[PDB]
Amino acid sequence: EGREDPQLLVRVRGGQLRGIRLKAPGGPVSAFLGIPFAEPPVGSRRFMPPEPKRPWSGVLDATTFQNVCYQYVDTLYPGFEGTEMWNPNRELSEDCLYLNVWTPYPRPASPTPVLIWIYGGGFYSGAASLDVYDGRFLAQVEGAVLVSMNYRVGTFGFLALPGSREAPGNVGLLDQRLALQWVQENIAAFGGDPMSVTLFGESAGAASVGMHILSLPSRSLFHRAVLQSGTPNGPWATVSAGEARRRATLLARLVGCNDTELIACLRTRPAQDLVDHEWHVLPQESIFRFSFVPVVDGDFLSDTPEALINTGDFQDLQVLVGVVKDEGSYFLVYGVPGFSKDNESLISRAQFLAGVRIGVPQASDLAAEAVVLHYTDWLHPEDPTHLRDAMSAVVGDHNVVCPVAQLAGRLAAQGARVYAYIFEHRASTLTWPLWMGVPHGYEIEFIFGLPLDPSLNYTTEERIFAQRLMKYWTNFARTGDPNDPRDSKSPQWPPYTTAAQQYVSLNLKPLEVRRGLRAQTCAFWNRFLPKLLSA
Amino acid sequence: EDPQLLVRVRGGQLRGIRLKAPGGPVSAFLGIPFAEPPVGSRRFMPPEPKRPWSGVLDATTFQNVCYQYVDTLYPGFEGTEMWNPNRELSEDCLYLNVWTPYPRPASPTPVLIWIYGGGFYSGAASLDVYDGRFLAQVEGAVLVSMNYRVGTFGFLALPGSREAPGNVGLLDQRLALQWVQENIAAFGGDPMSVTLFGESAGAASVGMHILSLPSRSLFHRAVLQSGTPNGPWATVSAGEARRRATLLARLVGCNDTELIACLRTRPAQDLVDHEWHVLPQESIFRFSFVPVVDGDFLSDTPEALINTGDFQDLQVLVGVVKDEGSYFLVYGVPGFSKDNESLISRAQFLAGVRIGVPQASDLAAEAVVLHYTDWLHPEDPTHLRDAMSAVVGDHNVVCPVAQLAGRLAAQGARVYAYIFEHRASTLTWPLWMGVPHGYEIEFIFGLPLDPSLNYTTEERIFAQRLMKYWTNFARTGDPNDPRDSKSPQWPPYTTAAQQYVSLNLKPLEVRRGLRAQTCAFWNRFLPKLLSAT
Ligand SMILES: *[P@](=O)(OCC)N(C)C
Ligand SMILES: *[P@](=O)(OCC)N(C)C
């Protein structure tokens, strides 16, 4: 050193880092990108828990995003922004256990609340380095310290032979945990406050956040939580030990491969081979089902999430949870026949009954009859616009909206402070057709405040709206309360409670308060439908 | 010695009485016998035609009420008493009444035939609310009502036996309908335009004449008020009828022939004493002796018969009241009384549902609870009390009606449907019960036109409307008033549009779908649940 920017040299437990000064709309930020937090999980370490990163010599260059974890790359719609935005934007490699830090410039003198992002991607994709997770705006505008990590997805992060030493499963969850530990020990170097760490994540990121809520060793590593459109409970976020064993051994068969012999053989397989067969192991044709997800191992997850939400003590917990207007529309184009991004997708009753078997793949004939009976509009039972929307509702409700209600309910009753939202604003830029409304993931760019970049084409009300949301989020991280402590003018977001079940609408209009989160419909999914699966 | 009051029917001569209605005189022929008294060896037997009589039979007074249970739940309360027998009980009860305009119509007049309800265990054609003087006078209708056997006497069956074949109460009705084909012309009725109407078990009876071929030649149109032949309460299987019959026998100290002989030796009231101890479960809106699927009167189940029948040349008017379920809650659901407001608890609601849906398995019971609970206020007692009412009304009346209306329309019938929402000002039941079943009858019959009865002046205008709808329906097959416009028309009920009208003080409002979501539950899902316990 000697001739370079003094604000950009930091020491962490493993060594020296050089960050980069970055432009935000309203001024500069500090970014430290691609800080390794684990030994590269390669070679004999594939399928295994992360090991802490051994110290390095010299000044590690932390000025660019690092590798993205090895994963499936979607190609359904080439050139199409709506899908491309989620695709890896750095080299795919198994050597991907890196994390990123954004802080103000200059770094703050007093310790600042830390927000840690956990990306979604169904546990088979994702990357901390996508544009919509750019931490600079929350860093520049709200003075937050934002941290995001890569964690292993797909087989690499989730293939499990439960009980074995060499593939215990949940290791992707462990990468996340290791990055949380890294934050505890090192964030202060950046002016972060380790005693004020808030996890936020969306979809599998949200289910991830909830796993950490439910898993004791993770508990001491954060104080507050945000789950956007995802839950640790529900039909897709976990598999049983048996089922995980089953998918793992099938995948092994499909590629050539006593648990030791099998795993050892899997370890000799090229990464692309596992990705090529990843999708062939699901018990039924489905949507919103993923092959390698967190397992109920009786270790990380001591019991099913359903059990742990019911019987856990959430005394100390402030939690923000919510959903987008159309949780189910996105995946309809991936595998319900009838549906497409390129037309209105008006479907028939026949296509709807078939769609229900696909969106609720674990349902018997009777259970499905019940779904179809519930969501049919008996005045207009053949009406293709309603059917198309009912198909979206089934998928959205079953996988997200009702799980979120089950979670919000149990948490509030076990003594947690819960704030709930439904996000209803469709981006003016959005490239999915109108019929899809607000698909999951499309609140993210607002929360992170991307509309503040005047080069991005958002409307002026969208720029103001983004600021509102960044304020809710960072207020929540600061205090456990999304409300602005002075500003009593603006309508208050009340806690969600079992008695009143209040939540707010997030759109361009001021906060409006509503009651019951699809209460009638969720009684179907959460209370009735389980029992109809004891017959 | 008025010649207007003197008529020769096929069996001989009758002398009527001149009665007064608010706007003029009416000729009444009360207690005309249409069958041999069904007594002694005729108990449980089909009715035989009344033998001809000498001289002039006095038909100026209501005859006896068929032998039946009498309600004593709230002794001296007008709400219950208005349904109790207003004449002596007797097995000698097969009589009918005819009201006609005074003087007797110049040309053949459409006939309405009324069939009382009472759960097939009670009722009488002589109650004040079935008084036909108003329809006869104001609208010029020829109105006929008959007594039919009820309880064990009308409905006890040992199916297959010669001596108690079941459905005789219904055959009583059919014989009274035959009597009308043969005799109504003498009173200036048109036997070629006969319209049945009935309420509750009476509506079910109307529905069975629809589904029973030999009855079809005896009327041309039907009105079913708050009841249907299909659904949980109106029929029983042969197996189940045999079961209750043999159990009633055992209970009163008694091979088919031998068993019936013994039953015939018992005093009427001994049978009635044990009428209510034969039901398989604690229940409400369930009744021991009801029509039986006998392969004779009813060739198959009413469900089977409405799914496949051909109803091309049939006009039908069907409807329900706003609160079909409130009435029976006080008769055996803990927490319910007419005296307080019956704000019930959640536990009372779950136990109330096993009583309201007695044939429901544990899982089906739960589906119902989970459906009818308002999840925004799971434990509010007002909601829970109203949901209880709705479970019972929906399961027993509204959804069966929706089902019938759909089937009839799909299979060629011309159907009109209604919900009745006006609570009578004079009603003596508490407000929480709303509009209980049967409290439309007094309006259709035109009782508010009696200045002495203390109905509001709006209620009188309402009653006039209703009488016009019903009699227009009898005249033409269509309840709409030709002379009259814009304001608005009553559209036929169809499977596509599902249009019905609200009947209340405001002008007709057209609505679509009759508890459409909730009836999909009862009519489509619930059978599947139970079938797979
Ligand atoms: P989420 O992670 O969204 C991206 C696939 N999810 C739908 C589980
Ligand atoms: P309806 O006949 O009325 C009985 C008092 N019924 C509810 C079956």
**DSSP-assigned states of every residue in A468-516:** HHHHHHHHHHHHS--S-SS--SSPP-PPB-TTT-EEEEESSSPPEEEE-
CB contact under 8 A, A523 and B367: no
**Going by C-beta distance under 8 Å and a sequence separation of 6 or more, which residues neighbour residue A317?**
A213, A224, A225, A411, A415, A416, A417
**Going by C-beta distance under 8 Å and a sequence separation of 6 or more, which residues neighbour residue A6?**
none
- Under the phi-then-psi rule, with left for phi > 0, alpha for psi from -120 to 50, and beta for the rest, what region is B468? alpha
What b-and-e string marks burial along B384-421, b requiring 16 or more CB atoms within 10 Å of the CB?
Answer: bbbbbbbbbbbbbbbbbbbbbbbbbbebebbbbbbbbb
What whole-number distance in Å separates Cα of residue B156 and Cα of residue B154? 6
Pairing assessment for the beta strands B109-115 and B65-66 based on DSSP bridges: unpaired
What whole-number distance in Å separates Cα of residue B192 and Cα of residue B332? 45
Give the residue numbers of B annotated as catalytic, written as ranges.
200, 324, 437
- Our count of domains for chain B comes to 1
Number of Cβ atoms within 10 Å of the Cβ of B213 = 10
**Going by C-beta distance under 8 Å and a sequence separation of 6 or more, which residues neighbour residue A149?**
A37, A97, A98, A99, A100, A116, A118, A128, A175, A176, A179
**Going by C-beta distance under 8 Å and a sequence separation of 6 or more, which residues neighbour residue A208?**
A118, A151, A173, A176, A201, A230
The three state secondary structure string of B3-26 is HHHEEEECCEEEECEEEEECCEEE
CB contact under 8 A, B375 and A531: no
What's the CA angle centered on B225, arms B221 and B226, to 5 degrees?
140
| C-to-N gaps above 2.5 Å in chain B, after residues | 254
Give SS3 for A59: strand
Instruction: Identify the bridge partners of residue A32 per DSSP, sorted by sequence position.
Output: A101
Q: How far is A516 from chain B (nearest CA, A)?
A: 6
Smallest Cβ–Cβ distance between B363 and the set A520, A524, A535 belongs to A535
Q: Across B124-255, where does the E strand assignment appear?
A: 142-146, 189-199, 221-225
What's the CA angle centered on B109, arms B105 and B110, to 5 degrees?
155
If we measure between CA atoms, which residue out of B18, B15, B95, B3 comes closest to residue B55?
Answer: B15
CB contact under 8 A, A531 and B363: yes
Atom number, ligand 2, closest to the C-alpha of residue B202: 2
Distance from residue A174's CA to the centre of ligand 1 (Å): 19
Which ligand has the nearest atom to the CA of B438? 2
Name the helix (H) or strand (E) containing B20.
strand B17-21
**Six-digit token string for B348:** 């009372």
**Going by C-beta distance under 8 Å and a sequence separation of 6 or more, which residues neighbour residue A34?**
A62, A63, A64, A65, A66, A98, A99, A100
- Asked if residues A440 and A327 have their Cβ atoms less than 8 Å apart, the reply is yes
If we measure between CA atoms, which residue out of B164, B177, B160 comes closest to residue B218?
Answer: B177
**Six-digit token string for A225:** 């939580």
What whole-number distance in Å separates Cα of residue B460 and Cα of residue B449? 5
- Under the phi-then-psi rule, with left for phi > 0, alpha for psi from -120 to 50, and beta for the rest, what region is A113? beta
If we measure between CA atoms, which residue out of A137, A122, A37 comes closest to residue A86?
Answer: A122
Q: How far is A255 from chain B (nearest CA, A)?
A: 43
B5-8 long-range contacts (CB < 8 A, ≥24 apart) are B6/B56, B7/B186, B7/B187, B8/B186
Give SS3 for B493: strand
CB contact under 8 A, A379 and B521: no
Q: Which residue bears the tokens 């249009």?
A: B499
Pairing assessment for the beta strands A27-36 and A20-24 based on DSSP bridges: antiparallel
Q: Which of A353, A364, A374, A378 to mutate to probe the B interface, most B CBs <10 Å?
A: A378
For chain A, the residues whose C-beta falls within 8 A of a C-beta of chain B are 366, 369-370, 373, 376-379, 501, 515-516, 519-520, 522-524, 527-528, 531-532, 535
- Asked if residues B383 and B377 have their Cβ atoms less than 8 Å apart, the reply is yes
Instruction: Identify the bridge partners of residue B13 per DSSP, sorted by sequence position.
Output: B8, B56
In angstroms, the Cα distances linking B255 to A187, B67, B239, B288, B314 are 93, 26, 15, 21, 43
Q: How far is A353 from chain B (nearest CA, A)?
A: 15
Phi, psi of A152 (to 5 degrees): -70, 140
Provide DSSP, B43-63: TTSPP-BPPP-SSEEE-BS--
The three state secondary structure string of B271-317 is HHHCHHHCCCCCCCCCCCCCCECCCCCCCCCHHHHHHHCCCCCCEEE
Q: Which amino acid is at B67?
A: Y
What whole-number distance in Å separates Cα of residue B111 and Cα of residue A535? 54
- Asked if residues B9 and B186 have their Cβ atoms less than 8 Å apart, the reply is yes
Question: Resolution of the experimental model in angstroms, please?
Answer: 2.5
Nearest residue of chain B to residue A529 (CA atoms):
B367
Give SS3 for B177: helix
Report how this structure was experimentally obtained: X-ray
- Asked if residues B79 and B343 have their Cβ atoms less than 8 Å apart, the reply is no
Q: Which amino acid is at B140?
A: G
- Asked if residues B500 and B515 have their Cβ atoms less than 8 Å apart, the reply is no
Smallest Cβ–Cβ distance between B375 and the set A519, A531, A535 belongs to A519
Give SS3 for A278: helix
Give SS3 for A107: coil
What whole-number distance in Å separates Cα of residue A308 and Cα of residue A511? 33
What whole-number distance in Å separates Cα of residue B225 and Cα of residue B115? 10
User: For the domain that residue B458 is a member of, what is the CATH number?
Assistant: 3.40.50.1820
Radius of gyration of chain A (CA): 23
Give SS3 for A239: strand
What whole-number distance in Å separates Cα of residue A509 and Cα of residue B264? 79
B370 CB neighbours in chain A (<8 A) are 523-524, 527-528
Q: Which residue bears the tokens 């097969």?
A: B94
Radius of gyration of chain B (CA): 22
What whole-number distance in Å separates Cα of residue B182 and Cα of residue B105? 17
Is the Cβ atom of B118 under 6 angstroms away from ligand 2?
A: yes
Look at ligand 1, atom 1, and give the residue with the nearest C-alpha: A203
Q: How far is A383 from chain B (nearest CA, A)?
A: 11
**Six-digit token string for B55:** 């001289």
CA atoms within 13 A on the CB side of B190: 15
- Asked if residues A450 and A513 have their Cβ atoms less than 8 Å apart, the reply is no
Q: Which amino acid is at A9?
A: L
Report the residue count for chain B: 533
In angstroms, the Cα distances linking A275 to A168, A272, A302, B267 are 19, 5, 29, 86
Distance from residue A121's CA to the centre of ligand 1 (Å): 4
Classify residue A58 by its DSSP letter. Answer: S
Give SS3 for A404: helix
Nearest residue of chain B to residue A532 (CA atoms):
B363
Report the residue count for chain A: 535
For chain B, the residues whose C-beta falls within 8 A of a C-beta of chain A are 363, 366-367, 370, 373-376, 498, 512-513, 516-517, 519-521, 524-525, 528-529, 532-533
Give SS3 for A327: coil
In angstroms, the Cα distances linking B303 to A110, B318, B336 are 78, 17, 32
> Which among B71, B84, B148, B200 is the best mutation to test ligand 2's pocket, defined by most ligand atoms within 8 Å of the CB?
B200
Atom number, ligand 2, closest to the C-alpha of residue B328: 7
CA atoms within 13 A on the CB side of A269: 23
**Six-digit token string for A492:** 């208050």
Give SS3 for A112: strand
Q: Which amino acid is at B380?
A: D
CB contact under 8 A, A531 and B376: no
Instruction: Identify the bridge partners of residue B57 per DSSP, sorted by sequence position.
Output: B14
What whole-number distance in Å separates Cα of residue A469 and Cα of residue A141? 12
Domain limits at A259?
1-535
Q: Which amino acid is at B229?
A: P
